[PDB]
Amino acid sequence: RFPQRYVMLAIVADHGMVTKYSGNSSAITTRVHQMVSHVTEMYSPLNIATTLSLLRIWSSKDLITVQSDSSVTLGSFGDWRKVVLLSQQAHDCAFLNTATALDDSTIGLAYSNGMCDPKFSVGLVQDHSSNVFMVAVTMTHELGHNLGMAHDECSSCIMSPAASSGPSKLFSDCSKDDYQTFLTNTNPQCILNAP
Ligand SMILES: [Zn+2]
Ligand SMILES: [Zn+2]
Numbered sequence: 211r212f213p214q215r216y217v218m219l220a221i222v223a224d225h226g227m228v229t230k231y232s233g234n235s236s237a238i239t240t241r242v243h244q245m246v247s248h249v250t251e252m253y254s255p256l257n258i259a260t261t262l263s264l265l266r267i268w269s270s271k272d273l274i275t276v277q278s279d280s281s282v283t284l285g286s287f288g289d290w291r292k293v294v295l296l297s298q299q300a301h302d303c304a305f306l307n308t309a310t311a312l313d314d315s316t317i318g319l320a321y322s323n324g325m326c327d328p329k330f331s332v333g334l335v336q337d338h339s340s341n342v343f344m345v346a347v348t349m350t351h352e353l354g355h356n357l358g359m360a361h362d363e364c365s366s367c368i369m370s371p372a373a374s375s376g377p378s379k380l381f382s383d384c385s386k387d388d389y390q391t392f393l394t395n396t397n398p399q400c401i402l403n404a405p
């Protein structure tokens with residue numbers, strides 16, 4: 211249905227994550243890999259090949275102030291991504307994986323249509339469950355917003371506004387249409403490039 215596309219993803223695990231998993235960077239790495247495998251599987255149907263270009267773990271201190279308000283944190287993260295992370299290695303989008311509970315009890319945030327933008331191609335995902343698939347669905351959902359998708363307002367589809375108890379790995383037809391609109395009206399250049 212869609213032309214070949216690629217999302218060269220960067221993930222940053224904050225200091226809260228290191229604390230949560232008892233300083234075990236190896237365990238965090240294994241966790242993110244599984245998360246990405248799930249994300250990758252969920253994007254295949256849209257002909258988007260997702261890969262983890264890099265993983266950063268803030269084992270010393272956070273490089274930005276990570277706070278309970280997702281909006282402020284996402285903005286600081288986007289500034290850091292544009293001014294620092296992009297200088298280290300090319301990538302299409304970066305997501306901050308945080309252990310910190312958000313102040314409005316949400317579990318993620320992203321910039322709509324931000325894919326490829328130096329500053330706005332970022333997302334925020336709270337490590338809200340021991341079930342990695344569940345957290346991967348949230349990351350997939352936020353990448354969805356980055357890719358121009360709006361909420362399904364299908365209750366079990368990825369872009370559902372609320373996190374189902376039994377989430378599926380499918381994008382709604384509305385979600386696919388939003389993605390189509392995105393490719394047509396935006397058509398960001400970075401995701402055309404294979405790793
Ligand atoms: Zn520490
Ligand atoms: Zn707030």
Ligand SMILES: [Zn+2]
Pocket residue numbers: 351355361371
């Ligand atoms: Zn959403």
Ligand SMILES: [Zn+2]
Pocket residue numbers: 404405
């Ligand atoms: Zn090449």
